Symmetry: D2
Amino acid sequence: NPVLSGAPLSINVVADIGRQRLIPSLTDDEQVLNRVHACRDVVQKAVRNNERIYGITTGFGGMSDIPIPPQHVAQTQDNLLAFLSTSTGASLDPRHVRAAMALRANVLLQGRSGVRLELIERLVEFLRQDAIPVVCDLGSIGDLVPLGVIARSIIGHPSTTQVKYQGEQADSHDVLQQLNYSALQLEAKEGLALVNGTSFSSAIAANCVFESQRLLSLSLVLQSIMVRALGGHPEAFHPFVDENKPHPGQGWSAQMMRDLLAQDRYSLRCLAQYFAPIVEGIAQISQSISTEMNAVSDNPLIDVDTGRFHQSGNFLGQYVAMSMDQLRRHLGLLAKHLDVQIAQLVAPAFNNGLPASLRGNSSRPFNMGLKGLQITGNSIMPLLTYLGNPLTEHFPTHAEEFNQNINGLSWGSANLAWRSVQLFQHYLSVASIFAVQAIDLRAGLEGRELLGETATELYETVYDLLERPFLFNDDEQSLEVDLQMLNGDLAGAGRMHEAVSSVTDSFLAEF
Amino acid sequence: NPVLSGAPLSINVVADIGRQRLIPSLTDDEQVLNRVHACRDVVQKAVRNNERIYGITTGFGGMSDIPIPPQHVAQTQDNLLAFLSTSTGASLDPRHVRAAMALRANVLLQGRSGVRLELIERLVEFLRQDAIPVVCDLGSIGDLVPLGVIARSIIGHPSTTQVKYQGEQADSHDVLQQLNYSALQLEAKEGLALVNGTSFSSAIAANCVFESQRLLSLSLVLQSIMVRALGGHPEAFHPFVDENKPHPGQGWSAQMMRDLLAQDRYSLRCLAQYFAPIVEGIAQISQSISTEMNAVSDNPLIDVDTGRFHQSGNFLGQYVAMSMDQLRRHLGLLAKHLDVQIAQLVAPAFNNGLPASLRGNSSRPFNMGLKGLQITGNSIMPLLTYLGNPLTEHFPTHAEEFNQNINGLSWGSANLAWRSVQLFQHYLSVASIFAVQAIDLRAGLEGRELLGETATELYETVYDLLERPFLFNDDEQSLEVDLQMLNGDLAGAGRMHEAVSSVTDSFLAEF
Amino acid sequence: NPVLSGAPLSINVVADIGRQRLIPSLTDDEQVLNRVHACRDVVQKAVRNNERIYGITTGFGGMSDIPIPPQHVAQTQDNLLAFLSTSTGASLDPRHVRAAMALRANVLLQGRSGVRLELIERLVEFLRQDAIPVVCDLGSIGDLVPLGVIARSIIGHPSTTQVKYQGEQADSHDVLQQLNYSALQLEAKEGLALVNGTSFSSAIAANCVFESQRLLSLSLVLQSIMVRALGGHPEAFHPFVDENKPHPGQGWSAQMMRDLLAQDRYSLRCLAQYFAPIVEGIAQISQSISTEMNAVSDNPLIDVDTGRFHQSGNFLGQYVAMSMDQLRRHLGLLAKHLDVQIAQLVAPAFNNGLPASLRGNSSRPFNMGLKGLQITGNSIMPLLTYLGNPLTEHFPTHAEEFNQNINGLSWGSANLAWRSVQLFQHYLSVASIFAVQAIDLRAGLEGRELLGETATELYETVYDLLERPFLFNDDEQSLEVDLQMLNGDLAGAGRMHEAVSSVTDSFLAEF
Amino acid sequence: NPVLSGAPLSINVVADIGRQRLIPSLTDDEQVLNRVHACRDVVQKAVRNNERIYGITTGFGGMSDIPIPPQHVAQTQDNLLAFLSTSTGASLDPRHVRAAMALRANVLLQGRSGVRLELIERLVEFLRQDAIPVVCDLGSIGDLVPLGVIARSIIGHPSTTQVKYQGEQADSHDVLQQLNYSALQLEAKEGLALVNGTSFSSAIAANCVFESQRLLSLSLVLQSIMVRALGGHPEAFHPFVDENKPHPGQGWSAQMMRDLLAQDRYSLRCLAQYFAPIVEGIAQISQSISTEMNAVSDNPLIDVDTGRFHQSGNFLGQYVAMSMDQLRRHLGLLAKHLDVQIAQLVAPAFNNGLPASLRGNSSRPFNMGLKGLQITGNSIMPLLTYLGNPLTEHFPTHAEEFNQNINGLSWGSANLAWRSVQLFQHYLSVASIFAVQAIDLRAGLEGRELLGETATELYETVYDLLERPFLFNDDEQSLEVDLQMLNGDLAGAGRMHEAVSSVTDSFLAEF
């Protein structure tokens, strides 16, 4: 189980904390906790001497021109959480909320935010007890409102939130009492330090990146299966070809295709070249999101080695917004390449001998094997391609009394990226059924006998998930049940992700 | 209660059937039912003489080159529903499914599809009993799969669907038994006639249009309230101005503003000119969607006056796709105009004397009235503007074995339009709170005393929904609860829609 | 030759004035000129009594808070043209500038702007003498700067412009002297009245609409030729099909296809349904642009029947912006349908017997007939589809000291629409070559013998323009020369537009 | 002067060759030319033994199923250039054509394409003699047609092209004769090897990247000037802030701002955070484009160390397409940040004491200093933001007889990126005038006295280019002339690029 100490976290660990596959533990390192205490001491000394500092003794973003008298300082922080209670929309996936809580505790543990250690302890204990606040998906432009939901949940703020605990949704006060916590009154800068960052956007983005790495690996393995089913020529992946076009993505993709496996059409012959920018872009986005989520995004940065306060703009999530736009583009391009490959697989003009629509039985003249499934794929893929459009360009320049004239919209972009992830999971269920049926039909014409180890493992995982050519007569099964099973696996246990884990590990090691 | 007889339906009636505010009844007119029987007789005669007709005796779209022997004809139809069982994704709003069932029954009642009357009766009775099939949002490119869910539900097809009945979700077979229906075996062309149309896309679009008309009226009334709160000059809406720029939308919008109410900024002074294209476009989309949803979209069109079969492309939903793209644009532009007006309302540089962020109490120096609420609006509006991008342009040209090389993606476009409707409902809750607070503060500086009858009615409805200036101290309420109340009203009972019903009726009468 | 009197103009007349096929003449009607004189008298009376009126005695948009003393009133107008001299970018097509001059003179002739008649006379005389100011394509958000170029040109303002006259580009002062005009000093409100409107955006939009109507007709005729070349079944256009889906666009398109001419693929069988929304949208855009360009867009509207000044927002070009976005969408969809049809025509899997890539000679084994031409079409079409994205949504809310917080960007949208028109002209040259070659090859397998009157006329026009199956050996011609000839015809004399003039007239009569 | 030997070239050298600031020279290295000769020998041996190889003895992409007899082999290559003569549209900037010729010669010099050395010599000599073929901007989906123009120009192909030489445009045959070259008949694979790559797309992209690096540096310096003019607090760029958010772009941007120079608004306080993703993305695009342009993109790759032929997909320009989409996004975001900063600079609510619209003289009450200039900027910026939309997603899957079902559209994307570059050059002229005027007014309130060395150098360069606060009375100059001067400098000599060369060098050294 990971230890939270302010040290950088990997996207893998963040996603596993979000997935409840890892239980975070608070650090016992003396240096980290001493730095946190010293930061709180700097805040205390600034309050005691009535030093003029933004947030502590002034108003907030657009109304920072209004001074706050000392006796109201603490109240100001509480009042912050009162006016940030404007969270609406559909409820977020609790994985995002768990990841955000872990990331925020890790950020606060670096000793630049001036929080009390007890707030970090409450965050970590809520995460360990699986008392996860319900957070809705509207309210941030890139994170006062979504993070304010978590802050109000963990301090027992009178602006009651909803917290899921022990499988039931309850009031934040009830969950607080069940955790033997009392209501907490915020000290100076604490309420601002809990919400003035990019942790929630970074958490959604980290989940998107983890899923996208796994989905890229699964897409590549399904592509290898489809290429084998089409009888594609491995000549497209000879080392000489990528040696003369040394894009790292192309080299890694060609090496993967070599491991997994007059001229073919481009979707087969130019596969590594098509993959190269997607692979490299996903790697770049992974690195940038990992850098952002491990940064201290609080605005008043406290340096305890000098005892100074620094104005900051580290709460701006422009990088997360642009990275999520790019990630949506990558998912759309992967989906479109898979759709082109499937269109090749279903059409006898391009089948190279496969039955039309990959029908399993020729004896029933009215069998239409995977025609409706192809229509489902054709309905899903353009949604991903459409989500390839960028949201960052539409950012409001009038936001928050014209004070936040650049924001970024990393929150909306990350939620769109998660929508893309869900759509691509459904699409990959469709593509998995297409790949398995196509390879079975190809084996019959000449399934596991045609496939390498990783592709065989994925094929067997798909066969076992569906409890089983794959499809023989149209009336012998319901493809809806199979699609639900594969999608639930991709969203849940991830046996298909385990089946292609060698490719994912290769991508992580290379990039 | 409406009578379904194949006569054209209004979008209002379709939406009220979807909303369970109207219970459809099957017609007892002898001519309509006799035409349905004669159409089925034409199908029977074509089957008896083994006439070669698409769908009845041939394969389906991409595999229509394969003939079907007579003894399998009926089986083919059943088999259709077997291979179209590929519905996945998030579950649709049951309003869409009710509207689709009503529209499909109405289309089949026109006597061009060759169905048995008992299928129409089962559709109508499922609608009357409130046994609504669960339909997911992926699978159509503009409606075999989503309509196939309904067909399988009402005939008790072995590809089991999920049906919501008496408040509980059950298997289609259980609901069928509870309705005292037996399993039904499809005759020739019946399965194709149930699913080969645009009824589901048209139903989602009709719900979107109904909501968008109401939301346009509410937006206009909220704009009038905000203009009054800013102290805007009514000179912008003098009859002479629209008389010299005779866009119908501009004239109607200026007349509405006149009823509801050196130079102002453009968001106030050019309000009618800004509204004009939105008003006229919404009217055009209403008319086109109403035309599409009342059309016979079945491919083999049977003329009983001549007993002929006509090949058709009326199942293509290109018009619905483009209209929904335009409607999303209109909602985005309304949201952006409201956001600009709110940015004016919160900034003292443009307030014309209103407090910063519309704070209610100046005695508490740390009050930040609606700053977080403005941030929430700034997070919602760009999502609508982004959804202004068109989906129709991304349509797949390789779809369904390259046979459906033009499709349209009306299904995806309509689901995006409904997403826009939900986002704009949340946004209008935000804007309603902003309008009420701003008008209260303006009244204090100089609420209902400043407003006309319709605006006063909307203001009082908002006050009563929230059980109540509107906001005085930040800690005296939670704006999340108010936003939830207003959004639930807009999505549910629609008391705010009733408060502005005069404007909606004026729009319907004019356009 | 048209007479300009302030009466509404048709888009046809505006485009022909822009094309120099019509020479405008100033009206001699006593009522119109008397109204213009009375409007100028109202302005004079307002100046004499030092009445406080926006523009005349105040500052301009964002600086209207600054009063202007009477002795500087006239200077203010001149100074306006000094600070609006910020036109940059690529030079506009002179057709746009001619159309804008005609439209502005027509708008001023309605007697609401308070200009001297001599300014209107100078505009008309510059248009008649073909002394056309050079106007660049950047500077307007929807028309101070582009219209200011024309105003400075016709009054001899010290901010010198460039004017094309007698085939040579010269300084505005030189052209003024050659026209025997002296420098003109602006009176009150005159400089503002010359530039404070949507006339230039409306002129570009009117040219786009004229071209788009002609291009829609040409697209439909080329589609009929391609459908005949594929051996498509006319059953798709039977009156019964559109009778049961009564979209006006579908009915008109099916009637046109009937005149011009198991199941076909959708690009043929659903052609009328695909066209319907494009036809109706083009008609709607035509009507809205015609309404906008004939409106008085000046801000201070003077009513001479009451002698009053009215504040206006009629200078806002939101409708033009949205209509041009929609028109770009329509052109993109037409191009994509044509590209799908061409992809059908070149592939022997879908040719129905035509040679691969429409090669003319089978004896030369290395002939690749229209492969490069298809690649050219595939490079052009996605540019049009991409231009289907809307620009209006990106409008700046901070524009002009935050005073123009809603603008529209009709100028940029209209220039994008003209870019779409040019791209689609190139694309239609490509499609014309494809259609002619395909129909010749189809005739050989079973050109003018297969075609109706309008299609035969277009085929013969294409044959005569290229001085001539159409292509036999690859080395016997250069397709670049043919593409240049067809594109120059579409951009210039329009013999191909004359060949399909019956369809264009039918569209105008119906819509 | 650079030596072309097949070794990788820098984007700087490619752009300077395109700009005629460097004259390429062909290598005299024995190993490189010997490898080229050996590659041609491998091709000769394959032809002599009638070995079946794609391109040499088969048909081309979609028609490669058709064998070619030996006697026609050479003719096939010539015939290729005949059917690829389908180049249309607007003429490209000759910089792109020079860069493409240099890049293609460099690619062929690597000895994998099997060309004769004389073809490379003709390419290099055409480049050295400044005989540049006229190439139009339509015809490629990512480069047969645009590269075929160059090939036909340098070999004197009967499909005549237009070549600019000695300042005059002439027929390719005339220029060939003036260069003392005779017509050249292509040997096997040579015509395919000249055109089957990404060199032209890579050349346009390399020019875009060079310009974008310079424009990023200029944008950063102009931002520093505007921040100084607003009186922004340098606290936003303290090393502690970027130390705690270690994005490399943020660190480099903050270091640059430190060198060049209750809370500020975000456009000032979050400037480094906003820049970070743009800086890093521009660096990534530079690296990827440099990798692509130095790769061997020919399809039949010949290995002379083994004498083998390898099928390749290295002609696919997906990476160039996606990189150019991202670069357009980066330019749009830079433009929007500058527009937000200018909106701050012109509004007295946010000026911090500057005159409204940056008017120079308060004595003339009707002076509107840079209002029209701000409108021009507001018209340019949304075009760049709109061009931030991606084109790659719209790629045609039916292209070239469905054989090129994935292409990329790198050609269209790169041409769009160059359009963005031109728009941003115009925009930066506008922003330079705004910065100079603002800093002069700030100096008057408290220009070169407020600026560091690089900013002073840029300010003095702008003052010298315009021959000169900067603007005092509106009628004392024409801003159009100044904008033309600054834009011509940015497009031509680049004195403003020299003034900020330290920042560009810092960016190159860091990234």
